[PDB]
Structure 1
Amino acid sequence: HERGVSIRRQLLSKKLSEPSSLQYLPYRDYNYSLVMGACCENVIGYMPIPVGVAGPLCLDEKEFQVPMATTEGCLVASTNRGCRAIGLGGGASSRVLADGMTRGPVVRLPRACDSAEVKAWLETSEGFAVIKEAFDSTSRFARLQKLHTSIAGRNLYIRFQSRSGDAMGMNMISKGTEKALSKLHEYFPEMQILAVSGNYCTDKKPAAINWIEGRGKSVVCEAVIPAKVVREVLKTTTEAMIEVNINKNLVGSAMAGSIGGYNAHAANIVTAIYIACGQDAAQNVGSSNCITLMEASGPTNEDLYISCTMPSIEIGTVGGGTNLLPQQACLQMLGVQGACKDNPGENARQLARIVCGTVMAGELSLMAALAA
């Protein structure tokens, strides 16, 4: 494998204006067996991304050391300060509210009257039952939970929402969708399948549907930071924090015309954790959706109550980049690497809770720096 990468590098070198540029791009002593035929093509090396650690993050009575891969200065230090504030506040609590990856194909019928007939059929328990039967027959973990349909004339967009064990689930859900569509075509032979993804999923593009209905894991996290911790650790006050949160995260985002971006920098934390843990970094587009809320709490309204709600965290602990060793090391640091053998899907849910809690730590710290 290594020799093949060396040769490809040599061939590529002939096509560059600055062939000496490759000298600083590492490639030696790396496990390419796990990469080939699976994670990347035309490999010429690897890009090292610095990994820092923030923690301990006291979440649901457990302590986590969160790995973060980034090239942005202050991010890890800031997130670490947020964790500290949460720890001194007795820790954070989280809950997974929903779980289901989606795929939203588009099909078309000769007339809108026909597509309406198909939608009505898909809404009967009998129609759902046969579609679920076809969808689920593709893999052990593919378990269809619900369907959401929407028509545009003779076009019909069908959003399939399904469980997928500990996997992020796109390949699995796509395979299930394809067989369900084949089955639907048997019931409606005049139906033309236009695209397995008609952007109704919605995958890797901002979309109100993900914000409102959720995609992947929907999670909520919360904590109460004592007034003394707000002053001594965050170097500010509860009142200033609340004023910034409302006018930045709520009013500011509204003025900017944001759908799902009611937070300070959830995307920084999501991206850093995703890269470190072998997730699909491009999914930061929808996985970053977040609304951050803050209120005065306690005896004299001097304590800070904070919560972060993320309805569409697209994540997994098996498959894709999580198959690589360095990435598995970071997943193991968190205790969620691979399949949860006793209860499939539990490692992915735990990782989603960790992401939401670290986002909250990051929000706390940046808002405090903005307020101060």
Structure 2
Amino acid sequence: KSVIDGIPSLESLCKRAASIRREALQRVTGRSIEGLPLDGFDYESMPVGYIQIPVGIAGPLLLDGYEYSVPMATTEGCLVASTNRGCKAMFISGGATSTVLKDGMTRAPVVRFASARRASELKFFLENPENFDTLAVVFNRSSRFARLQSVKCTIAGKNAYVRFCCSTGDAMGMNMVSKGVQNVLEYLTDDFPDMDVIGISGNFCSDKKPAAVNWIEGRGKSVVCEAVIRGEIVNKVLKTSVAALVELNMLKNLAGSAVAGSLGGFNAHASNIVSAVFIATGQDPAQNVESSQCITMMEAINDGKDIHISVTMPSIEVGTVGGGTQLASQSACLNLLGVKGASTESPGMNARRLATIVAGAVLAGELSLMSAIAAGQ
């Protein structure tokens, strides 16, 4: 208790230190943090406690022939219940099919020269296919798992925003892409000694921000997920018509988002589902900003009898290794999905499958909410 004393004049004595700081904070603050638990968490895995978010289960989600019980960390029973209704409707409709369209994490440092002419010489150097193997060798010293895929260099005046894209195995891969970029920036001091490195991120990555570069180019896992709901199931189960769902999608998710001046927001509530699964599975909750990017498409097929439904999500940023993924509670949620840790089969397959599951759960959420709106007409 004398430790709490010196309040007078943290960075520690983990749990013992955790306990000391709590009393110091309540004493100095004058505020009770009574309902914030200390006990029940391994702090070895400036902590003062931990918050609790309840995990609900949505499913079974039938995806590429497999059944998933989707963990959703949220306050609202109504989000789990609604996603669950979407899972049931797709389960009797042959389930969902996912396709991974692209897989690579990006980092875009800003560097500058004395002229745009000189900056353009870095661009032409880096984008010359003959130089790729050398840049990749330098980059890939980053890690066992780092594989450079591309370098795109955008010039703005005497500045270059140099977008590196690489695979990172089952890691989300922000630390890996960064080490790789540092290798290439050090290697470049030979042919480019006039280069000033302004920052490891020039906001062209673009990390934890909505950006057209990510919508156009993708970032992390670019995924499309689709299902066909038969007319008879749209009528009997979803209590609407093919026509009403197609029209609502066009008026709400396409025209409405257009009128609102949306960037990547051509969907009903992808953000709700992405956030809940992200927190359950120990992802970075700040990457929900670009991971929720989605265009929902609903089209009449088979002479207007059935509906083709899809979500296209260009920038799902997930990993199954590192960060919050290796805490006990979040690890258990990845294990439920069968994507805990690195892939046995081939590096990155677990993080890819996680991305397809997010997209499948988003498709279920879109079908359920859009059906409820349409049925309520």
Q: Equivalent residue for 1:38?
A: none
1:304 equivalent among 295, 302, 307: 307
Secondary structure in 2 aligned to 1:14? helix
Q: Equivalent residue for 1:335?
A: 338
CA distance in 1 between partners of 2:54 and 2:84 (Å): 16
- 1:220 equivalenced with 2:231 (yes/no): no
Task: Tell me, yes or no, if the aligned pair for 1:131 and 1:184 is still in contact at 8 Å.
Answer: no
Secondary structure in 1 aligned to 2:189? helix
Secondary structure in 1 aligned to 2:188? helix
2:361 equivalent among 324, 338, 358: 358
Residue 49 (structure 1) shift? 0.3
Q: Could you list the per-position Cα deviations for residues 6-46 of structure 1 after superposition, in whole angstroms to 9, with x for gaps in the alignment?
A: 1110111122232x2x1100111211111xxxxxxx10111
Task: Tell me, yes or no, if the aligned pair for 2:161 and 2:204 is still in contact at 8 Å.
Answer: yes
CA distance in 2 between partners of 1:169 and 1:150 (Å): 22
- State TM-score, norm by structure 1: 0.96
CA distance in 1 between partners of 2:344 and 2:77 (Å): 38
1:205-216 correspondence to structure 2 within 5 Å: 205-216=209-220
Task: Tell me, yes or no, if the aligned pair for 1:224 and 1:305 is still in contact at 8 Å.
Answer: yes
CA distance in 2 between partners of 1:94 and 1:342 (Å): 19
Q: Equivalent residue for 1:7?
A: 20
Q: Residue 7 of structure 1 aligns to which amino acid in structure 2? A: I
Residue 178 (structure 1) shift? 0.9
CA distance in 1 between partners of 2:126 and 2:275 (Å): 37
Identity of aligned residues (%): 59
Task: Tell me, yes or no, if the aligned pair for 2:254 and 2:266 is still in contact at 8 Å.
Answer: yes
2:253 equivalent among 246, 249, 254: 249
1:46-85 correspondence to structure 2 within 5 Å: 46-85=50-89
Residue 73 (structure 1) shift? 4.1
1:25 equivalent among 36, 45, 48: 36
Task: Tell me, yes or no, if the aligned pair for 1:316 and 1:348 is still in contact at 8 Å.
Answer: yes
CA distance in 2 between partners of 1:126 and 1:15 (Å): 63
- 1:132 equivalenced with 2:136 (yes/no): yes
Residue 146 (structure 1) shift? 0.3
Task: Tell me, yes or no, if the aligned pair for 2:56 and 2:77 is still in contact at 8 Å.
Answer: no
Residue 184 (structure 1) shift? 1.4
CA distance in 2 between partners of 1:71 and 1:117 (Å): 53
CA distance in 1 between partners of 2:203 and 2:189 (Å): 20
Q: Residue 331 of structure 2 aligns to which amino acid in structure 1? A: Q
Q: Residue 211 of structure 1 aligns to which amino acid in structure 2? A: W
CA distance in 2 between partners of 1:304 and 1:44 (Å): 51
Q: Equivalent residue for 2:328?
A: 325
1:108 equivalent among 97, 102, 112: 112
Q: List gaps (5 residues or longer) in structure 2.
A: 1-13
Secondary structure in 2 aligned to 1:74? helix
Residue 342 (structure 1) shift? 2.4
Instruction: Output the aligned Cα RMSD.
Output: 1.0
Q: Could you list the per-position Cα deviations for residues 317-370 of structure 1 after superposition, in whole angstroms to 9, with x for gaps in the alignment?
A: 001000111111000000000000220000000001001011000000110111
Equivalent residues, number: 362
Q: Could you list the per-position Cα deviations for residues 111-142 of structure 1 after superposition, in whole angstroms to 9, with x for gaps in the alignment?
A: 11100111111111232222211110121111
Secondary structure in 2 aligned to 1:160? strand
Q: Equivalent residue for 1:37?
A: none
CA distance in 1 between partners of 2:343 and 2:333 (Å): 16
